Design a protein around this ligand. Structure first.
Ligand SMILES: [Mg+2]
Ligand SMILES: [Mg+2]
Ligand SMILES: [Mg+2]
Ligand SMILES: [Mg+2]
Ligand SMILES: [Mg+2]
Ligand SMILES: [Mg+2]
Ligand SMILES: [Mg+2]
Ligand SMILES: [Mg+2]
Ligand SMILES: [Mg+2]
Ligand SMILES: [Mg+2]
Ligand SMILES: [Mg+2]
Ligand SMILES: [Mg+2]
Ligand SMILES: [Mg+2]
Ligand SMILES: [Mg+2]
Lengths: 102, 115, 100, 82, 126, 151, 100
RNA sequence: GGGAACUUUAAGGAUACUGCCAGUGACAAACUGGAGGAAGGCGGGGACGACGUCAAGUCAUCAUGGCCCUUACGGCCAGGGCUACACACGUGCUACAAUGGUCGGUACAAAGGGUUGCUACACAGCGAUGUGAUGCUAAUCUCAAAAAGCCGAUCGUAGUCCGGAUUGGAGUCUGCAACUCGACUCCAUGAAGUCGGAAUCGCUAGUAAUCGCGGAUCAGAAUGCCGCGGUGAAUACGUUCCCG
């Protein structure tokens, strides 16, 4: 699946982050393989230039071959935490959808 | 027939057939045929020796293959040697007339090179 | 826009107004056939020697109320942001919404 | 290309500096910012330093360069590879 | 002698009808000259072959606006209305044919945010 | 749709032969609204086929169309998570439409110089009984025959 | 032989019709003969104005302004008719041009 | 010369209301089939965005609370950059040809723009254009050639008489000035491409597909955006499984 990850001005992005995100996301979602053709993750900081418990928003939206695109959001205090929460939520959502459609 | 050292197609109109020589297009072919007196729709297989000689004489007046190729190469290498901006673009094999190289420069750089 | 931007625009307009007559005369001399070649060349040199801001090509349209350099809409003289407000308040004569 | 009837374009200050240099015999470079001027046939044999954005690069004008603009010999971008 | 007006897709036709040998002129031109397309000629000719009295009338026609199909439709509508004006008993058969009706279909305008009246840009979900 | 019953539009008969069937065939051939070129193609094909054997072109066309029309088709029914292709009869309008589409597609995939020539070749082939449209008719019969068991 | 040509331009057709009716009535009182009013093709001018401050290209307001023109001729006019026409007052929104 | 008939132009009016007939339904709303009519059951389009949702977007149109700089985080200027190029995505344009390319002849629009402008017409040039000159403040003069289309000839399935990227010479114009970095013209060159993975998008009628024309921005610089007309389709048995 092709991976298209984007951030905002607050978050700060780099090709190193691109490689790491691609690797981790593929490693987690390797089982589905052909079922899914596209991932797009997006990162923001909400109240940019300030702080808080969450203060960062991760999103991941995935296109499954066949059924319609499905999206997931998460809020966390760090980029890694946001990514992990979003990955867990995507895994749960895809498992539920695939069990439903059988 | 063989004009300027190349065998042009035989089963073709003369105007279309002459455009198989480097350095001659449809305009030049029309000019040559007007000078000789040959009708454009006439096919090359219908021409006799005298017409072939006339066409060769006309074509010799224009630079076609070696004269044109060496002239073009000399200009390009002159630019590359002098080192102007166009010469540097020639050296690096990138668009020479000001096109975008961020995307769509595949006619100069060729197939995409993976990292 | 900034007051510096607006003042630069105003000084450019003032310079263009100052030098319009000489610029036009020099261009006419340049385009005059009966005039001598040396006279035409001297006219060209003077036109090239005129101050840069005298050239109208260096002027940018601005809203007037706000000085914004985009969406100018020559006829009204206002950029879209203020033109919409003035129109939909009812202060611009003849202008209404379009449905056809 | 500039229309022939208008003729070549050269800045007045650069032109005057060039005439002073040719009238005298001094090889000191002529420092200038006029990348838009044309290399006139009288420019040959002179060293002219042309601004390229942050520094002045020298150019020794030879017969080949006539017809080019000054800026064509002073590249403005620094690229060394990806 | 009897006049009719026809309209179709921005085209308007003025038709004058008077008993005659069968002449048919359009803008100082013949049907074959004006319409190089056979469907247009067939459409122009339907109304009077419908009554089986084609050559017992003479027609003088002017047309303006639209294209070949619209002009042909307008000319036919004008001929039908001229026949109705000439005789009242023609209207039921002409309406049964459907020529009495005036077609109201017209081009739909382009709309904001869309490439055309109905077509809209691509929304890819690949 | 979920409601209403849309009425069918009327196709005027063709100029030469005054046939609504031939007009509909021209509409199938037509591309980009170039109906004049569509008529040219169809009439050239009809003249070409008439040249081979002296018969009424309209009668030949309708006979070949009857030869190529389908009998029975299946419509996929999704129950119990399975395809369940169920044979069913089809209305005459669908019969004619599929016949015309098959003829035109087979002609398009033939290998002559011009559309008129290859359409005429397809009509001759369908009249003989060996063509791509004939093969699609055979395949649909074969599949609806394999699945006859279900209602 | 003298004929007076009258041209009315406005942004409001009701106002321009009122003006033309008043002119023809004034001419009738004087007793001259007048041709018109003759409607002339209306000019339409349509503009697209973005309504969002920053980024929404599809969300716009479409405005229009219309120019209405009316033509009048008065023929065989008398000295009292011309003075009456000059004396007649002019209302705003209707620009009137008088040609001898 | 004339006419005020027709087309048109642009204000004001009429018309269409299940109005009438035959059926259905509680004898209710309402729903089917008909006559007449240009139009028959919201005729077709456009504006018009309920209470509310996402600390959704905009301190860079603008205003504004609170913080920050004050010989610089303010102001003037000349050059350069925003156009970079191992790559990855989104939206498009042009093609891969014979339902077509080229050449000659020959018909039919609608909407807009024009006085710092549009320019008839003659000459010069292969051409972009230049000179002289004419009518226009415009239902008057002009942009302006509509193109697909029709008739005749050639091409005869070839990377081609398909395609027009890239590069080499020679120019026009706008502008103080086209090097970085403009649009267009002529000669020469002739690239990938021979119909495109999984996947996925738009569209129910004058719609889709296809063909040309105009405008705002603007000295000049549209394949983008907003409009205009020409030719003109395919298919809906049905709501069972797809989603909201
Ligand atoms: Mg926020
Ligand atoms: Mg400010
Ligand atoms: Mg400007
Ligand atoms: Mg050049
Ligand atoms: Mg259209
Ligand atoms: Mg419309
Ligand atoms: Mg409402
Ligand atoms: Mg933000
Ligand atoms: Mg900001
Ligand atoms: Mg600067
Ligand atoms: Mg940019
Ligand atoms: Mg070609
Ligand atoms: Mg190849
Ligand atoms: Mg412009």
């Amino acid at each position: 699946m092709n991976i298209e990850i984007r951030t905002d001005k607050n978050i700060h992005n780099s090709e190193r982050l691109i490689t790491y995100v691609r690797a981790e996301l593929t490693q987690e979602f390797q089982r589905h393989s052909e079922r899914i053709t596209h991932f797009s993750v997006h990162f923001s900081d909400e109240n940019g230039d300030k702080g808080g418990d969450k203060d960062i928003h991760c999103m991941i939206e995935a296109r499954p071959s066949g059924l319609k695109p499905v999206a997931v959001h998460h809020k966390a205090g760090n980029i890694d935490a946001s990514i992990h929460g979003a990955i867990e939520k995507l895994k749960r959502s895809l498992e539920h959808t695939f069990e439903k459609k059988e | 027939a063989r004009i300027a050292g190349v065998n042009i197609p035989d089963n073709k109109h003369a105007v279309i057939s002459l455009t198989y020589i480097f350095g001659i297009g449809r305009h030049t072919a029309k000019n040559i045929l007007a000078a000789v007196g040959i009708t454009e729709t006439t096919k090359i297989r219908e021409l006799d020796d005298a017409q072939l000689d006339a066409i060769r004489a006309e074509v010799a007046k224009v630079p076609t293959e070696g004269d044109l190729r060496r002239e073009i190469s000399m200009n390009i290498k002159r630019l590359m040697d002098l080192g102007c901006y166009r010469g540097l673009r020639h050296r690096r094999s990138l668009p020479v007339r000001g096109q975008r190289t961020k995307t769509n420069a595949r006619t100069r750089k060729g197939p995409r090179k993976p990292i | 826009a900034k007051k510096g931007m607006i003042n630069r625009e105003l000084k450019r307009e003032k310079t263009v107004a100052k030098y319009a007559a000489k610029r036009a005369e020099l261009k006419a001399t340049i385009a005059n056939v009966n005039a001598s070649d040396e006279e035409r060349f001297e006219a060209m040199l003077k036109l090239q020697a005129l101050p840069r801001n005298a050239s109208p090509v260096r002027l940018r349209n601005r809203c007037g109320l706000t000085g914004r350099p985009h969406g100018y809409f020559r006829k009204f003289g206002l950029s879209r942001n203020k033109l919409r407000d003035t129109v939909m308040q009812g202060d611009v004569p003849g202008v209404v919404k379009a449905s056809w | 290309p500039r229309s022939l009837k208008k003729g070549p374009f050269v800045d007045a200050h650069l032109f005057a500096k060039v005439e002073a240099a040719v009238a005298s015999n001094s090889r000191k470079p002529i420092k200038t910012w006029s990348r838009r001027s044309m290399i006139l046939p009288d420019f040959v044999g002179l060293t002219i330093s042309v601004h390229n954005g942050r520094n002045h690069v020298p150019v020794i004008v030879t017969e080949h360069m006539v017809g080019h603009k000054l800026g064509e010999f002073a590249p403005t971008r620094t690229y060394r590879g990806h | 002698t009897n006049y009719g007006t026809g309209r179709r897709k921005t085209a308007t036709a003025r038709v004058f009808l008077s008993a005659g040998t069968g002449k048919l002129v359009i803008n100082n031109r013949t049907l074959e000259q004006y319409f190089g397309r056979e469907t247009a000629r067939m459409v122009v000719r339907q109304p009077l072959e419908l009554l089986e009295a084609t050559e017992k009338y003479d027609l003088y026609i002017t047309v303006k606006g639209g294209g070949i199909g619209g002009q042909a439709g307008a000319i036919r509508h004008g001929i039908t209305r001229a026949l109705i004006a000439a005789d009242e008993t023609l209207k039921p058969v002409l309406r049964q044919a459907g020529f009495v009706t005036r077609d109201a279909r017209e081009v739909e305008r382009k709309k904001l945010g869309l490439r055309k009246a109905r077509k809209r840009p691509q929304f890819s979900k690949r | 749709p979920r409601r209403r019953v849309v009425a069918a539009r009327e196709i005027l008969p063709d100029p030469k032969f005054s046939s609504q069937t031939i007009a509909k065939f021209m509409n199938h051939v037509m591309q980009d609204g170039k109906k004049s070129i569509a008529e040219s193609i169809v009439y050239g094909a009809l003249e070409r086929v008439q040249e081979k054997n002296k018969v009424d072109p309209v009668e030949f066309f309708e006979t070949t169309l009857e030869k190529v029309r389908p009998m029975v088709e299946v419509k996929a029914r999704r129950v119990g998570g399975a395809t369940y292709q169920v044979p069913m009869e089809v209305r005459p309008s669908r019969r004619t439409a599929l016949a015309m589409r098959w003829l035109v597609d087979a002609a398009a995939k033939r290998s002559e110089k011009t559309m008129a020539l290859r359409l005429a070749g397809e009509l001759l082939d369908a009249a003989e009984g060996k063509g791509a449209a004939i093969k699609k008719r055979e395949d649909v019969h074969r599949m609806a025959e394999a699945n006859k068991a279900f209602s | 032989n003298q004929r007076i040509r009258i041209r009315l331009k406005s942004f409001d057709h009701r106002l321009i019709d009122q003006s033309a009716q008043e002119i023809v009535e004034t001419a009738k009182r004087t007793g001259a003969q007048v041709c018109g009013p003759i409607p002339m093709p209306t000019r339409i001018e349509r503009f697209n104005v973005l309504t969002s401050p920053h980024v929404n290209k599809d969300a716009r307001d479409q405005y229009e302004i219309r120019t209405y023109k009316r033509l009048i001729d008065i023929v065989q006019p008398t000295d009292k008719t011309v003075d009456a026409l000059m004396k007649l007052d002019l209302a705003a929104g209707v620009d009137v041009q008088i040609a001898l």
